[PDB]
């Protein structure tokens, strides 16, 4: 016997996941989810997600663990290039687009999206950064689009030899192979810190 209050004020995971427009990888958006009951069962029981990897916590032990903050990051990346979304990984995305901490605790979501983000002529709304002076720190974003000083001749804001443009756009197209089709990605982060606990899993009675 156990009798807990009514279930109300559920977290808006539906609008985060079932959206239409996702930002590019170099300009991912972050949304703070807090002060609501978060039922992660509806996320797991869905068969739409091809990739569901959880680091530091079993997925079915989330409906009892009460955190304080949940962050959601959404972006679109290539097919054979989603393997870089994992702690301690190397590649263009990890180096210059989105860096995950080595001790990251959370879950990564990825499902194919060839039905919406592929134009027969070519979808060019999605860009990924190629160059930067140094590696991204864990959980920061770069928005500046200055000319990358490839060599030692100063660019002075004018594109030239060894003066390249850092942002290049994916040429998404339905004809592309499985390894080149777009893959929507959502990353959930869980924090514990000295504050009252707000988010919880549903408590069945």
């Amino acid at each position, epitope marked *: 016997i156990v009798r807990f209050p009514n279930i109300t004020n559920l977290c808006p995971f539906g609008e985060v996941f079932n959206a*239409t*427009r996702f930002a590019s990888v170099y300009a991912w958006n972050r949304k703070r989810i807090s002060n609501c009951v978060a039922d992660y069962s509806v996320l797991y029981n869905s068969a739409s997600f091809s990739t569901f990897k959880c680091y530091g916590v079993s997925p079915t032990k989330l409906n009892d663990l009460c955190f304080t903050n949940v962050y959601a990051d959404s972006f679109v990346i290539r097919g054979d290039e989603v393997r870089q979304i994992a702690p301690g990984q190397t590649g263009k995305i990890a180096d210059y687009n989105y860096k995950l901490p080595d001790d990251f605790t959370g879950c990564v979501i990825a499902w194919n999206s060839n*039905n*919406l983000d*592929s*134009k*027969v*002529g070519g*979808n060019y709304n999605y860009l990924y950064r190629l160059f930067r002076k140094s590696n991204l720190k864990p959980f920061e974003r770069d928005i500046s689009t200055e000319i990358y000083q490839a060599g030692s001749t100063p660019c002075n804001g004018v594109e030239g030899f060894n003066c390249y443009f850092p942002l290049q756009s994916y040429g998404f197209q*339905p004809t592309n192979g499985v390894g080149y089709q777009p893959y929507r990605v959502v990353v959930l982060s869980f924090e514990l810190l000295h504050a009252p606990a707000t988010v919880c899993g549903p408590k069945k009675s």
Partner: antibody
Amino acid sequence: EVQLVESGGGLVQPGRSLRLSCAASGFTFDDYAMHWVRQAPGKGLEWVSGISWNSDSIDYADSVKGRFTISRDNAKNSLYLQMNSLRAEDTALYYCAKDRGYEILTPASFDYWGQGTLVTVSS
Amino acid sequence: DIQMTQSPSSLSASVGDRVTITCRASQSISSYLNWFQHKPGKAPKLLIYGASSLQSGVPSRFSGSGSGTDFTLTISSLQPEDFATYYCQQSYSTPPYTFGQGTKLEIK
């Protein structure tokens, strides 16, 4: 439960112009794409035109290029289709479909439709 | 280019049978086909998006299958409100959104 009501149909002489409108109220209109689908009086369906969520990419059917101009109004939750230089083979039935995605030429198909409006081209 | 065909044109069945309709394409489309239920008196409705994915809110009696070039729609129970004309559409080639011809379905 989404509503798509059309108007502007009737009868015009060949070579004249007429306009169509299609009002949407059951969903968020500012970030979906829409199309126009023609059904012949005694034949199958046929695509005509399409517009993006914002008026950037517009495509037309091969048989109606250079004659039809589709428009869109995000503020009033309505889209229009200006028909120009009508001939005798455009006496069909016109629907107002809704795209599942946000672009024009995607694998995603038409999700929600509306009742057709009847047009006639004869003297 | 691309061409789209409908093998059956008129079919007959009863309330307690099963009906399969096949749609054939001229070139490979890679599981990008859609099936529409067009009632003669109202606005046509979509049943299956993608090769074999069933849209929300429609009965599970309709079942689609097939990939590559040849596709097929299957109906299991044949409830007596299931009279309509069904079209198959491709959304993968350069000629945009090509519709196949009608497939009349009457019960007797």
